[PDB]
Amino acid sequence: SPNSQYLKTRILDIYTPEQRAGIEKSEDWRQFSRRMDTHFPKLMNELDSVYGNNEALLPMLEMLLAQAWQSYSQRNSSLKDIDIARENNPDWILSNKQVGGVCYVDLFAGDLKGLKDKIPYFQELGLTYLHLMPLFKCPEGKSDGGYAVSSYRDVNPALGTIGDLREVIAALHEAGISAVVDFIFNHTSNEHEWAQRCAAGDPLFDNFYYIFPDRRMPDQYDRTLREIFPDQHPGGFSQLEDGRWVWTTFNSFQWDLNYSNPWVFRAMAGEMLFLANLGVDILRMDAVAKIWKQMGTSCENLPQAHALIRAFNAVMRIAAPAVFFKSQAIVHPDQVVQYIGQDECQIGYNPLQMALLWNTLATREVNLLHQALTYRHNLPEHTAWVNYVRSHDDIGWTFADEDAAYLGISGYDHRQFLNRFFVNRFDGSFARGVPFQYNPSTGDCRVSGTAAALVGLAQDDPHAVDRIKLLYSIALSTGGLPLIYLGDEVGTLNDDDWSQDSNKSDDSRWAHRPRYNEALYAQRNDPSTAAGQIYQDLRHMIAVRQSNPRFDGGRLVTFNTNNKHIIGYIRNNALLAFGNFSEYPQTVTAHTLQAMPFKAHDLIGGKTVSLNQDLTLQPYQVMWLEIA
Template sequence: MTALSALETDAAIVVEHVARREQPADGETVARLRAEFPRLHGLFRALYGDRATSLESLLTLIDAVLDARADRPAELRRLDRDRAARPTWFESERMLGGVCYVDRFAGDLDGVRKMIPYFRELGLTYLHLMPLFASPEGDNDGGYAVSDYRTVDPALGTMADLRALAADLRDAGISLVLDFIFNHTSNEHEWATRALAGDPVYENFYLIFPDRELPDAYERTTREIFPDDHPGSFVPLPDGRWIWATFYRFQWDLNYANPDVFTAMAREMLFLANQGVEILRMDAVAFIWKRLGTTCESQPEAHLLLQAFNAVLRIAAPAVLFKSEAIVHPDEVQDYISPDECQLSYNPLQMALTWEALATRDARLLQLALDERHELPPGTAWVNYVRSHDDIGWTFADEDAARFGIDGGPHRRFLNDFYIGRFAGSFSRGFPFQENPRTGDARIAGTTASLAGIAAGDDGGEDRVVLAHALAMSTGGIPLLYLGDEVAQLNDDTFQDDPARRGDSRWAHRPERPSERYEERRDESTVAGRVFTRLRHLIDVRRATTEFAGNELIPFHTPHAAVVGFIRPATDEHGGAVLVLANVADEPAAIPSETVSGLDESAWDLIRDSAVGLGRGLVLPAHAFVWLRVRRL
């Protein structure tokens, strides 16, 4: 049977199946199903073969999709239609994201609702709340070990509270973003407890082996992610079996080779979409498919699974977008970004290389990333950030570093030492995360202010904080603030006194909301006030600068290794172009007139709202930047 005849035959079966359903689908939904079915059918066959059981699984999935669409509230259906009319809404220069833990920043979901006036003051259009669902007591990887995707942690509120918050945020022009933690569940999830009890259906939801033969074979090619927690990729079960746990021992990887797992997780995803979540952060996308003899990262099937989840959303909740979290080789990061997979993606390379440039006072690796690794497909966007809830890993490509005579391994060790404060003259006060004495590997934890020098009292600390955010705000896509950084919050060292957290140094940069600093945010005699005022001004300028919409970026090179430069071109015939130059060095950089000779001598400084003459070049002070509206000759 040919692929076409298989599609035609299966489509006819689906039509008959849908017609027999007790609750008939509306015409709009049927049209969406017809449009997406060929793609979904092809993806299911590629993932699960052409056997009859695959069609049965696909029919079960379609029932789940149609049920979710029928349950979708009217206001979210209106959002679906609005977003269909404005498919690039997220590329606007007015977009600004914020991220926080509910309990650490606002106490509970009602506290978050009370913060909406502040979010509007700041200019947020996107709010990412860190994992807030039921999870094990004590250490739970900051909520990334989910025990129930449909139950909010009682300490934070209820699902009704979450729906109400989503509606209030939407009314305020703010999209709610939540994590979809779909690589694994906690070991307390109902599926996990039933698997442990020997239920054969749920045993097949995970990757469980009777002895070490296959785990040993897999671990010859997989890498350790959290060596402080356990070696390798597997942990023992009480009955002597072994289960795959890529991250922490209480996070058990799901078996996506089982189509029932895909359908079960699709139901959870659609449930979240119907609560009013507009963007789902797809956690740990690189790890969702396993293949013996490989790293079990970024396998082709991982992309097929994301495309299949995407197709499901296009039928049942088409307003919802995916944001990829892929901390892998830079070449692999971009593989996950497309309108058919993840429309948004973190930009870990730019984040890491911003910190690399500040430590080395050399922007060449960052410039190279903007030159060669920034472009994205139409209909997609980067999420640019200075730091997140997670650690900072040095994700640059060794082959890129080699072009500048840099050996990647020793350079990463230098960066770790620098940001931990072990390197003489370092301005940083960070912590090592998952430091592996055997390999020398480590990552870095710390708030922006602590890593940039404010905690150490370094004179350049405030400028570095603002410079890093200015780059995130001007390179394209959606800039993302870790809430608290806008008032220069410092590390919380007390995590070391908490038995549930002392083993995870990332809690240093997840402090409780620094109320006293927020109270100082309008007082420019304070660090918090100066940083807030400067960042708030950048946000205002960005919102008024149409050239900052979208992702397009044209490299602009200068003679200085410490200066990164690019042009953001006009998005329509009415705009100009904006030249961005940033100096990561501790001393001024003079940009000669020859470098800017391709630009009209008259420019406009968007930050200072004043005219600038380029005829004699310009001078960038230490840790300074400019956003200049220019006209290219």
């Protein structure tokens, strides 16, 4: 039954009495020792519930915490300053000053050096937070856009070196920007040293993955598994050349790590420590839902999965307190929120709000959006949503069917409409998206396409610009950390030649992953062009959000607009937000506006607005009203 003091002397064992004296009197040790006393009990409790009486548990922990000391000992002192800051301010994530951006290093800026050169622009745009897409060594050719990781410790050589990454992170900190990076902890590539060695039968790598002699067990699992990339293969398994089968939730070249082995936790915790010491502020925990497998279940959102993530959290509290987790879970809304906790992932993607933003543009009806913002927005203390419009991924229509039923909506019919609308198979749709993973056996389908393509900008729809403005306004103002897909701010369209690369032709997500459009960025300071209007709008909303404390925190209360086309919510009893999702003008009545002040300044238009009479919003207009 190992404890804090026990492991601390196991750690201090390697030192001679001469250095032990200097170590024990040092601040580094004093801090580590305090943090062990505070957080180790949590680590022990979480791992005990997963690994029980496992023989490997004790020695795994002796090794892991020695590594943790050695990692913290080596940790840059600038980062140790950030550790203390974030320990003492858990709510930094909840500040209205936080605005995020995300890009592919190669597609946006060429390489890590070019990314560093682009930092003055992130400053111009107002970012405090930057997510760099998977930047690690991966298979040449097909790699799932870097999501098949061949090494967590090596940069993708097209991008530069680990030293460049260190340099870039340092420059981002100097510029007041947090560095955000993926921790792809559910699976590695099949080319990872661990995968190669486990498959070869190296006993040190026994049970690093899920490997089977035939179809017997994969057949048992497949009957309860959801299909993630049905285009690629059925179920959750792929066959090796020697005849065996390996768990592959995603592509065949992505092998699911086996977390029922305590050594796998150890291995991945060591890689996590390495990334922490790069100065990474937030790790996007990729596919959090899948890290525990259980026969007879969906192998999604299992209690042990939560417990393991909570264990990973404890390790950071002990050895790099500055590092927070970002949950990536595209599941039922009831399951999305369960990853979000101070002792789990402090922030999480908000795919419900995102999906419903696009839903509401299509139907023009705020019913589902209003419902979601009313019952599913508010979070526990010291946690926040990451609010977004578009990402590197396809759009899944992951609203709750039970929730929809109350508004007289049937799941499939609605999703079929949504899928047809956004892929331009519907009468007069403005959207120019392409299908992704149409599953003929179930009817499920997702949508690829850039924000600009989905709103009608490719064919110069006169409402397109306002649509982008409107969607982003909600992400920026509901409460939580808003994330811009970089390129959106100048209206970057689809790369229509995406499938000409034979390594990209089987994954339509590439359509919404275009290179930096030089011409559009050159027009960002010219308000005449679409790029300039979008840039001016988004830049204006960012500036308002970051300097106005009415936007602070993550809580909201919805406001009943009594118009099916207009969304209403209130921030801090002081900011009233109206968003019209109709291409026609829409009215909030005097009667409905009774409780409000007679006049209010609109932060979007810059006008004073009257609320003692009918308020009429132009097509797609957003108002940000100071009511207190």
